[PDB]
Design a protein around this ligand. Structure first.
Ligand SMILES: CC1=CC(=O)CC(C)(C)[C@@]1(O)/C=C/C(C)=C\C(=O)O
Ligand SMILES: O=C(COP(=O)(O)O)[C@H](O)[C@H](O)COP(=O)(O)O
Ligand SMILES: O=C(COP(=O)(O)O)[C@H](O)[C@H](O)COP(=O)(O)O
Ligand SMILES: O=C(COP(=O)(O)O)[C@H](O)[C@H](O)COP(=O)(O)O
Lengths: 123, 458, 458, 229, 114, 114, 123
């Protein structure tokens, strides 16, 4: 019988309960995104990497859901390596940032995929 | 000229040359007539009683226009096996129905016709809801896109858990079980359908302790959490009291049993949830009383369309693989009817009519009932990402407790998501994906050992 | 000690030595198991999933006392056929139920068990409502005695009539048909179940024209008149708007479809009617979807008991002789359950349990559906004075119009009453009584010639 | 791919092969373009600015489906004569409109397009309100049949009369003029559109005196009377 | 009027005695600048585009991005009320999140005309 | 009263608050000097397409409009004529603001003259 | 394509998006203020240099808009150098203060100009 730690286990939604993604596993996620016809986009955050409720507490209101957009959604990108080129660029400019890769479906108008691609050392 | 007396229903109500209008509500009834009752008469009797007709000629028909208002049996389709079974297609004019009222739609279509002495059995298989009628309903308080946007959850099915035992736990123990489940990776926990307000646990006490559990588990994990708080009650005043308190606590989601609570109360709650930003989870308690038998009742697909019109953000849609009845193709068919904007006629999936939803929000289907970790690949493959997979016994039955139970289900789900995204076949490589995940997850390995060889095949 | 894994339901949920308590809710389920499923296991699975159990062992059971809370299959009764059908008697402790909530009672008892893969079919035949649970309900807003006292009507069944065609009439034509029916001797007229508020006739217009008709016909005849105004709506807010306006008109009676509206909305209306002196007529629209088949669903006697708890002054109870299904002995059985204070167990009438109502008011049963003048003696004999006999087609289908149609029905009823009071046998001298009254009633003679030979035998 | 800058409206908004849907709101605009503005561009500018478009390319268009949401000029029908005048037929998807809101319908369709520098004049001649949109409105509180049934008036036009002078009468004189009109055979009298509540006559005073007049004239004639308040 | 070909109302002199019966602006120029703490320059705004078709989440995302870059305000298009593509309450809540995030980031008061 | 400006009557507002006028509709960075000169400080200048149409996205779009406005404000306050030195003020600002330079190249030059 | 930083870009209203003002550019702002007939005034803050909402959150309520007045508005001042003399005096007394120069119009009763004139090193 093992006890699940109540500290040091902060999560980042989809794929965060699996071992950290390798560059090959990350590439495969981007390849799936593109094969599905979705538009990749990068988002980053430096100050508040987790949801909180400071400004309002009504149902469905949470602060920290919006992160900062890295440039623009990559419309027209057909190559997964171009998305990973952008990831390396954001990691270099902001080494202490939390970074997500997202994929948009314009028909249903919803993010169809989201996963953490980088985190700071300590959080 | 008015002539008193009984005439055959087919004289006015059987119209095989009728061209259905895009504004008509169409019904596909599986009719089993009594011996000696011709299908044209049985079909016309169904059309007449469910619309404007009665058993004898009434003079008042002449003050109105039956041509404009009558329900019409426009087609009889003979059926394989059962004798002397047939599908009677009935068209009802838009003017017969009260706008925004599922109660009124059911009252006319399904009100009295099932009790006809002239029939042995009757099953309503499908309803074509005209898009002009769809527009009179609010439909889901939020819908798939809005719900995922509010919860910040994308790219995988959502994970839930029902607190167990169904009844008997105190409010404090309920909140303790809730916090332990949520902190382990489940997005949601939930009251059971029958947990309302009882001597063992009063609702307000449960709501406060569960809110404490939601906020503790959310702060701990960094992920948005919810616990479906049951608003189902004896009256609408109690129902709204419960939704008002959930709103005061700032919690994201509430739940309702639409069939036992009823359509009138469900539509009231759906309106309240839209006005107050609450997500609404729906339980289909009592559906199998109505939808189980092939020869009589109403197929779940009709009850599913009725819920989408009345309003709900989630609806229980069966598991296929779990402890309760549900066939694959029929399930996939009603899942499309719940989620999609346009669903083409497809008899292989039980879709008798093309259904247009004219942008009404989609409902998230919920797989719940006797499911565990080994079912994860099959569940992910059948439902895809726009679903909620619920594990009551599959979480609280884990040998290490709730948090490890929740980790096991979350790891199993994420392992299936990554595998699928990598090009693997969940339908074939299922067991292998899970066994691979067991090697690095002790929580999953412990769940796998307990539930090996647990299947539901009848 | 907590041991994860699946165990048989029969280990905790089958208790053949259990002594039922007077506080237990008892259920008589007709179970058809899948081949290879023993009755003790199928029965225990029913008891478990409708109370506290799940498919696997949960550690949380130890935080509570299952002995105190569990549902228990205490008796298995093999039934003729094969099949391998049986009656499973299940006892549920009083603590499991929310006070004054029919919704909660149904959610637990009939919520999920009907969908079990391990069963082929399931029908809930009867429920013993413990008198301690009965006391938590208001029940009928008025009941038999109060209703007679309010309307000043004694010594005969009440007479009603449904306005026809079901749909299509304008508000003014509705009020015209109402006035003509009421002025001829009917105590009541009513909206059909599906008449709510539609493009052909909006509710508020109907309510005011029907009030004009009630007051004109009452002043003309000197007898109190009513028209059941339908409050059934899409939302509780709309349902209450309707009841509020009927209250403003000072009109005596309102109507609701309890199954399509739902129990939550029905209980709110029943409470509103009690607070505002309105009589509440109940339509059982959709019941035959649930209660028609012998092997699956819920017998109407359960739905009848549920209505008396939730609340209604009248309820549709079938005709026996009319166009819709209903056997004599079973009908007499549920009519006693609706009207009486104490009903002893009686299997020849389908009464599985002794039912004590601890002074909860009785409900007036309503006979409606394909009945006419020749059915009057049989109807008076089956139901007796505490009943409402309803003639839609049998009034509006009279060759001379509504007022003569109403005279014919009133003369036929009063002829049966005088004959019975004089010592005549209604069951044997039926046709002769009606034939005799034709000599002094031209209205009755005209109805008799139109409907002679119209029967419903299948 | 997103490309910043100005493009012609006709590239996205002029669709002459578009098949209108029964759910679309259709608009017949009489367009008078400025000289040098082709009808296909003026029509497309009307469709764009009354629906989803702007003067320059926005990246956000790619987050949604313009095919699903855009207004479309699907047909140009020239007007005889030469001022460059034509009828531009525009189709707007049902999703663009707020249910039961005439305000929202007018805000989109007639909101900004009439002020375009590229046009000399613009007239909206007709609108095809789709029956799916019609169903989201209550429409008249009563309508023809109900009104006749309520007033017990059949077989002839109804007769009314507007109280004169438009303004200046006191509440008592208003009621006196009302009773005299109604008692002579008119079914209705009415306040002028101008008469609301003013220093010469406050509304509540008028309403009470007009009610006295309605009931006196109705009792006298035996016919139902009204005064539009 | 049949007796006229055309008529255009060019101006109205509203008498100051009539002006006094109206509340007029809820706040007006000075009060607005004092409430927003913005002085010495025109205010800067931006209408979210496309006019119609964006979801509530995408609306709030576009809002936050505009406000964080130096605009004092963003705004719903005149067309944007409550529609199948985006219901108002959803938009209001996501736009409030965007306002508060951008205000905390820049240190300047922000608004989004709802 | 001022007929050259279409004011037919003298209008007295007896301290009723003033309304902030909003300049909106097809404007971009090159219009900033003309907008600042016509309206002055008590105005709202709105850029829909002029922000969401920037090649680098919303936040750079907003920076371009904010830099262009503040460049006009500083220039005016320093004694420069916005009606004559307009294009020069903007070109000067492009040299130190990459966001403004990117906007200037996209809208240089888009005009509305009929 | 350059990304606008979501950190280290705190602003101070009018002129804060331009390069920092030189002593001459500052003097010219004061000269414009005086030429327009406005009354100069200095305001300073030491603890909370940005708006926040601690005491109330209703529409139009914000804390941190009021700063501390440095002496009084300089009624009668015709020379811009006298305002800059006062700035140097505040800077000397409070080196870690945020300092604004504001200009009042008594007719419209509104501040017609406001610009940051000093800030602490780190914020
Ligand atoms: C089930 C059924 C009903 C009919 O009215 C026609 C037909 C028999 C062809 C049909 O199979 C087709 C239904 C479809 C696809 C659309 C509709 O009707 O809107
Ligand atoms: O109580 C449970 C099962 O819990 P567990 O997860 O322990 O099996 C659910 O409410 C059922 O799934 C309902 O059935 P359906 O979803 O078919 O309506
Ligand atoms: O509209 C009718 C029949 O009118 P008519 O008098 O013309 O036959 C009723 O709904 C039936 O009685 C069925 O109800 P139930 O079986 O519940 O009584
Ligand atoms: O949506 C816009 C223009 O946006 P953009 O900034 O993209 O051109 C406004 O509605 C116009 O200003 C028209 O109104 P008016 O002329 O009345 O101001």
């Amino acid at each position: 019988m093992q006890v699940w730690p109540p500290i040091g286990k902060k999560k980042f939604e989809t794929l965060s309960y699996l071992p950290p993604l390798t560059r090959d596993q990350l590439l495969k996620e981007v390849e799936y995104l593109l094969r599905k016809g979705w538009v990749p986009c990068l988002e980053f955050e430096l100050k508040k990497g987790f949801v909180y409720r400071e400004h309002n507490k009504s149902p469905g209101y949470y602060d920290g859901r919006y992160w900062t957009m890295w440039k623009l959604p990559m419309f027209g990108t057909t190559d997964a390596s171009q998305v990973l080129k952008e990831l390396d660029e954001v990691k270099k400019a902001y080494p202490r940032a939390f970074v997500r890769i997202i994929g948009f479906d314009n028909v249903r108008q919803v993010q169809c995929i989201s996963f953490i691609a980088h985190t700071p050392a300590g959080y | 000229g008015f002539k008193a007396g009984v005439k055959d229903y087919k004289l006015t109500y059987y119209t095989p040359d009728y061209q259905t209008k895009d504004t008509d509500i169409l019904a596909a009834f599986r009719v089993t007539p009594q011996p000696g009752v011709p299908p044209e008469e049985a079909g016309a009797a169904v059309a007449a009683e469910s619309s404007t007709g009665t058993w004898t000629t009434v003079w008042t028909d002449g003050l109105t226009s039956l041509d404009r208002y009558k329900g019409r049996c426009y087609e009889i389709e003979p059926v394989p096996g059962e004798d002397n079974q047939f599908i009677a297609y009935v068209a009802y004019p838009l003017d017969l129905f009260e706008e925004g009222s599922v109660t009124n739609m059911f009252t006319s279509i399904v009100g009295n016709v099932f009790g006809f002495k002239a029939l042995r059995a009757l099953r309503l298989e499908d309803l074509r809801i005209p898009y002009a009628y769809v527009k009179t309903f609010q439909g889901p308080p939020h819908g798939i896109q809005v719900e995922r946007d509010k919860l910040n959850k994308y790219g995988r099915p959502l994970l839930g858990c029902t607190i167990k035992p169904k009844l008997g736990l105190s409010a404090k123990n309920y909140g303790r079980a809730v916090y332990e489940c949520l902190r382990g990776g489940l997005d949601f926990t939930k009251d059971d359908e029958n947990v309302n307000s009882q001597p063992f646990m009063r609702w307000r006490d449960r709501f406060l302790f569960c809110a404490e559990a939601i906020y503790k588990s959310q702060a701990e994990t960094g992920e948005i959490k919810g616990h479906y708080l049951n608003a189902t009650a004896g009256t609408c005043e109690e129902m709204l009291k419960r939704a008002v308190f959930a709103r005061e606590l700032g919690v994201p989601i509430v739940m309702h049993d639409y069939l036992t609570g009823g359509f009138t109360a469900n539509t009231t709650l759906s309106h309240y949830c839209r006005d107050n930003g609450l997500l609404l989870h729906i339980h289909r308690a009592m559906h199998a009383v109505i939808d189980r038998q092939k020869n009589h009742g109403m197929h779940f697909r009709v009850l599913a369309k009725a819920l989408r019109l009345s309003g709900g953000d989630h609806i229980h849609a069966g598991t296929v693989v779990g402890k309760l009845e549900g066939e694959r193709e029929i399930t996939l068919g009603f899942v499309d009817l719940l989620r999609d904007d346009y669903i083409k006629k497809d008899r292989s999936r039980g879709i008798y009519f093309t259904q247009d939803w004219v942008s009404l929000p989609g409902v998230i289907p919920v797989a719940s009932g006797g499911i565990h970790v080994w079912h994860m690949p099959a569940l992910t493959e059948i439902f895809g990402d726009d679903s909620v997979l619920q594990f009551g016994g599959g979480t609280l039955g884990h040998p290490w407790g709730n948090a490890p139970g929740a980790v096991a289900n979350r790891v199993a789900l994420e392992a299936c998501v990554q595998a699928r995204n990598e090009g693997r076949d969940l339908a074939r490589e299922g067991n292998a994906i899970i066994r691979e995940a067991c090697k690095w997850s002790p929580e999953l390995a412990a769940a796998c050992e307990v539930w090996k060889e647990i299947k539901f095949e009848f």
